[PDB]
Design brief:
The radius of gyration is 28 Å and the shape is elongated. The protein starts with a helix and ends with a helix. It contains 10 helices and 5 strands. It is 61% helix and 4% strand. The strands form 2 sheets. A 3-stranded mixed β-sheet has the order 2-1-3. A two-stranded antiparallel sheet has the order 4-5.
Length: 370
């Protein structure tokens, strides 16, 4: 023992270093493997950028928008969790569809927080909510109104909103809600089989005190970031092509395929961040969000056009989780080959040092006393 065992551990590390350097160098020299990996990278970017059925980021956008309109549906919708009008305790109600009676403030808003909202502020929110709803769904066709990340097609009634336009409207709406010092009264929300059972949420507080609100709000800038990165990467893809045997040397291709692969991993990673934000929402709040379309008002007409899209929410969220695990593995493997292509030179120099270290150490050990 003593410093002998340590020398053996050290020799062991050196030789593992040689083996992995060897593998990496061999990978960079493996034209078929390099092209195979590039083809996967490009094929993912092509779907991500151009498709509305096979794009993980597009699907993520669908989930986030649906959840923003789902939250709006809970918070306001057909029966608000706040009172819109002038709060003289005497309250003068604005004549807006969904406004609860003023006695609701007395019943459900004891405690410092204010639960009323100025009509002009509500108007701004309602307008943003309507714009976001139109961006998502074509009222005429009842079909999808969001374009692939590549943009809207020129001119049969096609989708006419970019995902950036929808994300921007969502961002403004959530920002406005966060900044408005009006508390939401969850007890105003009536959903059969949910608000009348245990676990029901009945508390009153500013939206920024609820994880469902905060988490959904945080998804937007992350998704905006992901969208930009998907578009940069589609651009980068255009400058990368399958290599001729021996031409994967070119420093430019080396550095580009590596950047390409890192970026595409970051895209997947942003999608994972969004999945995590959905999965961090307390179960009971998520249940309210999923069922928001069943919300019924406690007074006046019971609307026949609630926000039903929320029924697709959970499937869309699970799709993010499946996309992440499926493409996550594959991009890791592609990224690995790209890193080796990029490090080929550096590795060739490093393996000579590591091999010599091992040869030396092995020889020292060979001469050590027994």
């Amino acid at each position: 023992l003593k410093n002998l065992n340590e020398k053996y551990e050290q020799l062991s590390q050196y030789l593992n270093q040689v083996a992995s350097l060897k593998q990496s160098i061999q990978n960079a020299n493996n034209i078929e493997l390099v092209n195979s990996s590039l083809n996967y990278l490009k094929s993912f970017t092509n779907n991500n950028y151009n498709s509305t059925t096979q794009s993980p980021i597009f699907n993520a956008v669908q989930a986030v928008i649906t959840s923003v309109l789902g939250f709006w549906s809970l918070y306001a919708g057909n029966y608000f969790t706040f009172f819109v009008g002038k709060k003289v305790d005497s309250g003068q109600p604005a004549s807006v569809q969904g406004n609860p009676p003023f006695k609701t403030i007395i019943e459900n808003c004891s405690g410092i927080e204010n639960c009323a909202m100025d009509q002009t502020t509500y108007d701004k929110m309602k307008k943003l909510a309507e714009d976001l709803q139109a961006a998502q769904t074509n009222s005429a066709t009842k079909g999808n109104n969001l374009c692939a990340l590549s943009g809207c097609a020129a001119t049969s009634n096609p989708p006419n909103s970019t995902v950036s336009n929808a994300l921007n409207l969502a961002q403004q709406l959530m920002d406005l809600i966060a900044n408005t010092k009006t508390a939401m009264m969850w007890k105003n929300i009536v959903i059969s089989g949910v608000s009348n059972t245990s676990g029901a949420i009945t508390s009153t507080n500013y939206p920024t005190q609820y994880a469902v609100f905060n988490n959904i709000k945080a998804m937007i800038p992350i998704l905006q970031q992901a969208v930009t990165l998907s578009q940069s990467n589609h651009t980068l893809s255009a400058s990368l092509q399958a290599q001729a045997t021996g031409s994967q040397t070119n420093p430019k291709f080396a550095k580009d395929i590596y950047t390409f692969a890192q970026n595409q991993k970051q895209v997947i990673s942003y999608a994972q961040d969004i999945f995590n934000l959905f999965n961090s929402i307390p179960a009971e709040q998520y249940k309210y969000l999923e069922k928001a379309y069943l919300k019924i008002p406690n007074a006046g007409s019971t609307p026949t056009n609630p926000y039903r899209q929320v029924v697709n929410l959970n499937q869309e969220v699970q799709t993010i989780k499946n996309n992440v695990s499926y493409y996550g593995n594959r991009v890791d493997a592609a990224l690995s080959v790209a890193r080796d292509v990029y490090n080929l030179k550096s590795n060739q120099a490093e393996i000579v040092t590591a091999y010599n270290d091992a040869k030396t150490l092995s020889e020292e050990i060979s001469k050590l006393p027994h």
